[PDB]
């Protein structure tokens, strides 16, 4: 048959099977079709979409780092260096195809259909993430553009989260974590990265008393990542 | 791309865990028609082992979900159709390997060691076809798997030492074939036990430091034997 003759619940069932089979390309294709039907995603559907693309793009980012590390230590052989460079470029082309598809989904469906501030922050953070993934491999003026677009998306998310969400909210915390990584690694601005992460951590530490058992687990999960990053960057 | 560029691409793809790329590169090397070196032979084997292994894993998961699905005919039927897609990919992969074996690798193998290595591989990939086959196809794949393993077994018995890792690996996979495909635990246990005992009797005369690859496989033989007896 095909995705254009399937209803949403069938595509979601397909995504869940693909997830269990670790066929993440299939899972992303199913959730992409769900998103393209134009309706606001449920929490379950948003989880399936995000997990699929995290794994699809994640495999390429990981391959790209491996290939780039090998290029630094490769003997100066013309055939070998041309092979590694065309191989890195192949991976770069796939990564850019993946990220452009996610960013198209975000701008055409996910962000415009978001009816609640928690959803808006989530998708703007996602936009910031996927422009950051482009920035990881970009060069020259294109790098200037993807870096600027990452920063603008994160910043828009950051402003909404400070107005509509408590400092212990997992999405606000996760936004701070990833925006801090962006400043550290992409903008090479470690002081801004450390101050952004420390402020988010401290302000959340200050309000753990307000949380029940379940919320406390959710929040401290990501506060520990913020502490881990601070420890890594300042030791 | 010449052979040197393709082998370098395969090593890069291996490091990047891009095994479909790796298998495509080593397939192209093989189709150039020359006898593979030990290095190229291992790259080809690793690549396709990982390519078919990902599909075997997905197949086992989707099969499991399909079989355990109660009171949901729509999920059950979708699981069936997904399984059949994975089966078709698995059959295409195995077909490619068997074609390389029949056309290039086995006809160019002159040394007993190479013959056994590639006949074992032919047994393995017919075994993987047998994991998903049914009916007359199944009879054909099981018989062809057995034929290849038995041919490799008799060569390795005549021409290779009991501690040779290729001889030990064939005994391991051949015993797995008996256990899992033919449902013959007694044949599987006798094969694994004899290969282990013959290896140990020879290894006792030697310094094991140089036989780390053999002792690893010997441990796998012992592990299967203890699980299968129990």
């Amino acid at each position: 048959m095909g995705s254009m003759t399937m209803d949403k619940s069938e595509l979601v069932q397909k995504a869940k099977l693909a997830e269990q089979a670790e066929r993440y390309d299939d899972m992303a294709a199913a959730m992409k079709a769900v998103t393209e039907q134009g309706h606001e995603l449920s929490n379950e559907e948003r989880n399936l979409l995000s997990v699929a693309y995290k794994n699809v793009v994640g495999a390429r980012r990981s391959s790209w780092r491996v290939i780039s590390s090998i290029e630094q230590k490769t003997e100066r052989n013309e055939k070998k260096q041309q092979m590694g460079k065309e191989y890195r470029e192949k991976i770069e082309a796939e990564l850019q195809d993946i990220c452009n598809d996610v960013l198209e989904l975000l701008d055409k469906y996910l962000i415009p259909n978001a009816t609640q501030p928690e959803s808006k922050v989530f998708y703007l953070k996602m936009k910031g993430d996927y422009f950051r993934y482009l920035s990881e491999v970009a060069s020259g003026d294109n790098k200037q553009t993807t870096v600027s677009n990452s920063q603008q998306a994160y910043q828009e998310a950051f402003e909404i989260s400070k107005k509509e969400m408590q400092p212990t909210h997992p999405i606000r915390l996760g936004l701070a974590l990833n925006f801090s990584v962006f400043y550290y690694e992409i903008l090479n601005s470690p002081e801004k990265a450390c101050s952004l992460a420390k402020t988010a951590f401290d302000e959340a530490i200050a309000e753990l008393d307000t949380l029940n058992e379940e919320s406390y687990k959710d929040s401290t999960l990501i506060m520990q990542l913020l502490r881990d990053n601070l420890t890594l960057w300042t030791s | 791309m010449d052979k040197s560029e393709l082998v370098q691409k395969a090593k890069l793809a291996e490091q990047a865990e891009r095994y479909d790329d790796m298998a495509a590169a080593m397939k192209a090397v093989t189709e150039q028609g020359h006898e593979l070196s030990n290095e190229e032979r291992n790259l080809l084997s690793v690549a396709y082992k990982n390519v078919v292994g990902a599909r075997r894993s997905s197949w086992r998961v989707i099969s499991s979900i399909e079989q355990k699905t109660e009171r949901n005919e729509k999920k059950q039927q979708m699981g069936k159709e997904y399984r059949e897609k994975i089966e078709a990919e698995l059959q295409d992969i195995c077909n490619d390997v068997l074609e390389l074996l029949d056309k290039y690798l086995i006809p160019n193998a002159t040394q007993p060691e190479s013959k056994v290595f590639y006949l074992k591989m032919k047994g393995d990939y017919f075994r993987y076809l047998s994991e998903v086959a049914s009916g007359d196809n199944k009879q054909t794949t099981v018989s062809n798997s057995q034929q290849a393993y038995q041919e490799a077994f008799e060569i390795s018995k005549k021409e290779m030492q009991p501690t040779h890792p290729i001889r030990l690996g064939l005994a391991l996979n051949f015993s797995v074939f008996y256990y899992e495909i033919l449902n013959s635990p007694e044949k599987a246990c006798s094969l694994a036990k004899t290969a282990f005992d013959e290896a140990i009797a020879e290894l006792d005369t030697l310094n094991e430091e140089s036989y780390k690859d053999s002792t690893l496989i010997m441990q796998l033989l012992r592990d299967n034997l203890t699980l299968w007896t129990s």
């Binding site: 995290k54 997992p170 999405i171 974590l177 990584v181 890594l232 | 797995v176 496989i217 299967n224």
Partner: peptide
């Protein structure tokens, strides 16, 4: 049975 630390980023998965 046959023969054979980096900085952190996070994705939020609610429920």
């Amino acid at each position: 049975i046959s023969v054979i630390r980096r900085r952190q980023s996070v994705l939020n998965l609610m429920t």
